[PDB]
Amino acid sequence: GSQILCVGLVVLDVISLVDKYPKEDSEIRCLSQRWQRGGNASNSCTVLSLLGAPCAFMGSMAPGHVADFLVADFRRRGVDVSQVAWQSKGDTPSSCCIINNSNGNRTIVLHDTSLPDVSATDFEKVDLTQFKWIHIEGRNASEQVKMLQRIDAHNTRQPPEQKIRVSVEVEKPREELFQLFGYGDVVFVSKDVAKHLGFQSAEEALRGLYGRVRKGAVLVCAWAEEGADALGPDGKLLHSDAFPPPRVVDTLGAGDTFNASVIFSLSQGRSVQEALRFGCQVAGKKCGLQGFDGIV
């Protein structure tokens, strides 16, 4: 039980760096450009890897030249891809990401391919014994709930010292997902979701959503330059100020850096206060840099 597993998407990020966000109808030239391995659970693996945690990626991939780029990137990082659910139909997803360089805002246009989501059937075949932690990026909910009940089962037949710690991300204001709330020892809800649901701050969202989480779970909500808040069984609201870089240049994957960093910290035995902090600290350093290199 030495690895951390993330279950979610891997996506080709085609990045354009501009000095201002383009107005509708305009044509502006970008400052620079790059490809980046993306997808929420994929970025989290990058971050986990850079933090020193052995980790594995599980998601759908279609063979092709793009996949070859993604896979080589996974390996150069030491991310374990042996659990990937290769398809025979569909192309790999890709998105165009515009990063506003004077600002760091990132805007994503995602090309979601018919590519089949990883399934319970797929999950059932995974050797749960190599993993200390399993993080699941919320996508195919009803099918993922199955993957989760699977993990609980496994846990009911192990010492507390050998239970697989579990986390969930609910990032899109998409109702199917809300049942994931739901499962896991640690639950991440995005600002975006929190707002779409009527809440105007992290503390508010935490108080208003805590009723939905499995007993004994920690609800975590990051709120950009507002830092992040967490809330556990004891009813005590935890907060962490953000760590803004003096120059914000690239927020693409900041949330994935935050999740990864909170998980790593927790998986190392630190408190929720400390992990919240580390989360913000690392996310913040990332925002002062292009890509993920240099956060450590």
Ligand X SMILES: CSc1nn(-c2ccccc2)c(N)c1C#N
Q: Which residues bind a second copy (CB under 8 A)?
A: 14, 16, 18, 21-35, 65-66, 68-69, 91, 94, 96, 98, 100, 105-114
Q: Tell the residue number behind the tokens 């990020």, with chain if given.
A: 13
**Of the candidates 275, 277, 255, the residue with the CA atom closest to the CA atom of residue 194:** 255
**Of the candidates 99, 34, 39, the residue with the CA atom closest to the CA atom of residue 67:** 39
Q: Which is nearer to ligand X, 44 or 95 (CB)?
A: 44
DSSP summary character for residue 221: E
User: Does 205 contact ligand X by CB under 6 A?
Assistant: no
User: Does 83 contact ligand X by CB under 6 A?
Assistant: no
User: Does 224 contact ligand X by CB under 6 A?
Assistant: yes
Min dist. Cβ of residue 254 to ligand X (A): 4
85: left (phi over 0), alpha (psi -120 to 50) or beta: beta
Q: Which is nearer to a second copy, 14 or 141 (CB)?
A: 14
* β-bridge mates for residue 192, sequence order: none
Applying CB under 6 A, among 225, 233, 247, 271 the residue interacting with ligand X is 225
String of DSSP letters for 176-197: GGGGGGGSSSEEEE-HHHHHHT
Is the omega angle on the peptide bond into residue 38 within 30 degrees of 0, that is, cis? no
Task: Check: CB of residue 178 under 8 Å from CB of residue 209.
Answer: no
Q: Which is nearer to a second copy, 28 or 197 (CB)?
A: 28
* Six token digits for residue 220: 């975590």
Tell me, residue by residue from 262 to 281, as one string, x for binding to ligand X by CB under 6 A and - for no binding.
------------------x-
Q: Which is nearer to a second copy, 182 or 253 (CB)?
A: 253
| Secondary structure (3-state) at 76 | helix
Please check if 39 is assigned to a binding site. Answer: yes
Please check if 227 is assigned to a binding site. Answer: yes
Please check if 253 is assigned to a binding site. Answer: yes
Cα(276)–Cα(106) distance, rounded to whole angstroms?
23
User: Does 43 contact ligand X by CB under 6 A?
Assistant: no
* Six token digits for residue 120: 């319970």
* Six token digits for residue 283: 């996310």
Please check if 247 is assigned to a binding site. Answer: no
Query: Which partner in a second copy, ligand X, none is near 242 (CB below 5 to 8 A by kind)?
Result: ligand X
Please identify the residue of the shown chain whose CB is closest to the bound ligand X.
Answer: 244
Per the annotation, binding residues are 13, 39-40, 43, 106, 224-227, 253-256
Q: Which residues are at the interface with ligand X (CB under 6 A)?
A: 222, 224-225, 227-228, 242, 244, 248, 251, 254-255, 258, 280, 283-284, 287
